[PDB]
């Protein structure tokens, strides 16, 4: 925009036009100064009129490929995270009782809604109110899914601890009520 090729032609021709205005000679001097100027401007007609669209195209494409490199790093980040989640969530699969209950099936296919119900090693039961609390998780042990469970801790809404001494009928209406009992699998 101030250092193009034909710029020099323009510079000489119009410095010469001004030298001619410095002398101030014929009208054919005007013929010169008016064919030179217009042709030298017919130069920049193209130089600083095309390269200025070239710079548009250049920097545009460059920024697009910048955005693309960004997306392509994001792909790597998400893959690494998903992968480590799988390879940390598998390790608790309990690979024993499972190992049994699969290797007995007709062929590997065993509906999902029984894998936890026969191999999980912790229950968590949610109770609305006392009157239902009795008809299940009473005492220190209950049975459900026909394995023998044993209570070991109770929380409530606000997530705190109550001792199983307190859940009577009288001390009931002071209990953030959806008590959440967390048993274990006893043999």
């Amino acid at each position: 925009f101030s250092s193009l090729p034909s710029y020099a032609a323009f510079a000489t021709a119009q410095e010469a036009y001004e030298q001619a205005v410095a002398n101030g000679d014929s009208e054919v001097v005007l013929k010169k100064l008016k064919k030179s100027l217009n042709v030298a401007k017919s130069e920049f007609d193209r130089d600083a009129a095309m390269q200025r669209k070239l710079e548009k195209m250049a920097d545009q494409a460059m920024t697009q490929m910048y955005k693309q490199a960004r997306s392509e790093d994001k792909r790597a980040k998400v893959t690494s995270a998903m992968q480590t989640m799988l390879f940390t969530m598998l390790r608790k699969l309990d690979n024993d009782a499972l190992n049994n209950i699969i290797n007995n099936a007709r062929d590997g296919c065993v509906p999902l809604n029984i894998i936890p119900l026969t191999t999980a090693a912790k229950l968590m039961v949610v109770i609305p109110d006392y009157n239902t609390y009795k008809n299940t998780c009473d005492g220190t042990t209950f049975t459900y899914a026909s394995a023998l469970w044993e209570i070991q801790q109770v929380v409530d809404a606000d997530s705190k601890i109550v001792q199983l001494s307190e859940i009577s009928m009288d001390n009931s209406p002071n209990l953030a009520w959806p008590l959440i009992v967390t048993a274990l699998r006893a043999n």
Binding site: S71, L86, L90, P111, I115, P116, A120, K122, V126, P128
Partner: protein
């Protein structure tokens, strides 16, 4: 249909996915490899690789969007709050989620009373508020599925009502498209369970290239992918306190239901003058053209809205299937057959029986639509046309055909019985004869289930077409709900339009020199939305002069109304925009040392702007 019956008798801890321990790089996982639906029997995968040294990206995906790994690794759960068959649990502390109240917007309130609103006795009165909910609302709302029972549907008439519904959906066209022509507006909306820890749909719409998404979509046409699904609480103005809940499906379900259905979908939302009216604006005199197509010519019309109580949870499952079998009847060439089946089965495994994750704890969802998939607003429409037709067939058979007076509807009922029960295969001759009669004496118009039905009358008074005792009957025995005849109107007049459609009454104003049907809202609604906002930024008005403009665009047709205080709503809104502006301008002038110099904002506070949007020209 049969399996739907013979599958109550068996136990319910043996439905759902299957699994099988596969070994990847000498490490064992569990992965789904089939399904067992209550209807479509057993369905086995087809591309299971008993080994692999490395999983790619498409793989990693379809293995982390599965229930099997999460469930099969989680603590058991017994849920005594519901009846729905719980399944497993993920956390160690369940989570109780609540909903906050609105925000008051005081300055609009004082300015509203100054003009003399809220005078005890008026006809406009606050009613739509931001209701709160306590802790366990999420699950006491999930619970409502226990209104969804296994239902057998009659069959020798479902296999006819499905012809006629298909005939309705006939002028359209559709097919599979490729992964470079799909269109997805708003690309920062959540991606559902396993993925929403990492980013919004954008990030999974980038990293997956175009041949990836194509490998994936032409992969689940010979496979089955069970999926999870969060459950969410809406937070929006309303007139009742039972919270609303909406199901946010996970990415790899949309990211293929799109490529499958997109073309038919976007070729319904671009046709004018049919039965369905999705995609037809009401501005610039669209509403008038709707209500003038409906009244097509039927000889002694009336009208007849209606409504289904609890629509998306009480829906049987046979009718959701039938919906998808009419939305996938266009691929006579793009897809083969076992391709069409594994696609249907992939739908049923994702949005009619999936594993709702309401809370921090998977469950099981018996049936009925999930209202957040990628083809609701049309599935509901075709189910709706289903109910309308079958009410017609009941209404036409169940008539003492010895007293019928004509001699053409007599033979119509005769051959209706023949072709209904005494036949096994189609008869497109008579399907056409019927659908012609049915659209000459029962025009309709159907958004996503808010219908209007300009029935001829002196028939429906001798039971030659539906009525509304007939929709009562049908809803009863085929959907199991009672349609209380107190939310179903019947304008006996037409110079006034429909008492309510899309929740908007209709006034026959006389503008220009001719008569149109502007559609006005509900004064309390507009006022309420003025006063109660979410967030303290909605509050301050000057920042958001862009709401009051839209609200005034919606509160305009009240100006022509007869009752008074209505019109004053509009003028309140205009004066309020004026105050907002001419105060902001000077306000910013002081702390500045200049401000607004070039206006034509003055168009915002005079009605000749807002009037353009209800005269037909753009």
């Amino acid at each position: 249909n049969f399996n739907v019956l013979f599958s109550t008798v068996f136990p319910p801890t043996s439905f759902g996915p299957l699994v099988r321990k596969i070994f990847v790089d000498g490490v064992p996982f569990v992965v789904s490899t089939g399904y067992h639906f209550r209807e479509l029997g057993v369905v086995h995968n087809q591309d299971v690789n008993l080994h692999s040294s490395r999983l790619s990206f498409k793989e990693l995906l379809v293995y982390a969007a599965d229930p099997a790994m999460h469930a099969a690794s989680g603590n058991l759960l017994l849920d005594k709050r519901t009846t729905c068959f719980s399944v497993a649990a993920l956390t160690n502390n369940v989570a109780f989620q609540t909903v906050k109240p609105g925000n008051f917007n005081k300055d609009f309130y004082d300015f509203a009373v100054s003009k003399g609103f809220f005078k005890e006795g008026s006809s406009v009165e606050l009613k739509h508020f931001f209701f709160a909910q306590d802790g366990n609302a999420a699950i006491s709302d999930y619970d409502y599925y226990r209104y969804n029972l296994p239902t057998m549907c009659d069959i020798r008439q479902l296999l006819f009502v499905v012809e006629v519904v298909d005939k309705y959906f006939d002028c359209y066209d559709g097919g599979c498209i490729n992964a470079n022509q799909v269109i997805v507006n708003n690309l920062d909306k959540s991606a559902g369970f396993p993925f929403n820890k990492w980013g919004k749909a954008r990030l999974y719409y980038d990293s997956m290239s175009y041949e990836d998404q194509d490998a994936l979509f032409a992969y689940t046409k010979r496979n089955v992918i069970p999926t999870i699904t969060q459950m969410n609480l809406k937070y929006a103005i309303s007139a009742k306190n039972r919270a609303r809940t909406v199901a946010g499906v996970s990415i790899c379900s949309t990211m293929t239901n799109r490529q499958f259905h997109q073309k038919l979908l976007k070729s319904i939302a671009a046709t004018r003058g049919a039965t369905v009216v999705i995609g037809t604006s009401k501005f610039y005199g669209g509403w008038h053209n709707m209500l003038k197509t409906v009244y097509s010519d039927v000889e002694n019309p009336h009208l007849m809205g209606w409504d289904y109580p609890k629509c998306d949870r009480a829906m049987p499952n046979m009718l959701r299937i039938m919906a998808s079998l009419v939305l996938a009847r266009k691929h006579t060439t793009c897809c083969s057959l076992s391709h069409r089946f594994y696609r249907l089965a992939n739908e049923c495994a994702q949005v009619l029986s999936e594993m709702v994750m309401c809370g921090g704890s998977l469950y099981v969802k018996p049936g009925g639509t999930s209202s957040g998939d990628a083809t609701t607003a049309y599935a509901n429409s075709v189910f709706n046309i289903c109910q309308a037709v079958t009410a017609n067939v009941n209404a036409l058979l169940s008539t003492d055909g010895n007293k019928i007076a004509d001699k053409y509807v007599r033979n119509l009922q005769h051959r209706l019985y023949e072709c209904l029960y005494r036949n096994r295969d189609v008869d497109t001759d008579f399907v056409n004869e019927f659908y012609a009669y049915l659209r000459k004496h029962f025009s309709m118009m159907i958004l996503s289930d808010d219908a209007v039905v300009c029935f001829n009358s002196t028939y429906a008074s001798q039971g030659l077409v539906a009525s509304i005792k007939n929709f009562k009957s049908v809803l009863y025995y085929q959907n199991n709900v009672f349609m209380s005849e107190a939310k179903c109107w019947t304008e006996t007049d037409l110079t006034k339009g429909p008492h309510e459609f899309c929740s908007q009454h209709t006034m026959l104003v006389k503008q220009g020199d001719d008569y149109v049907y502007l559609p006005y809202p509900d004064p309390s609604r507009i006022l309420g939305a003025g006063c109660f906002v979410d967030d303290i930024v909605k509050t301050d008005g000057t920042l958001m002069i862009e709401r009051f403009v839209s609200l005034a665009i919606d509160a305009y047709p009240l100006t022509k109304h007869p009752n008074q205080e209505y019109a004053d709503v509009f003028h309140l809104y205009l004066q309020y925009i004026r105050k907002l502006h001419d105060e902001l301008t000077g306000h910013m002038l002081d702390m500045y040392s200049v401000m607004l110099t070039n206006d034509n904002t003055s168009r915002y506070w005079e009605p000749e702007f807002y009037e353009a949007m209800y005269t037909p020209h753009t």
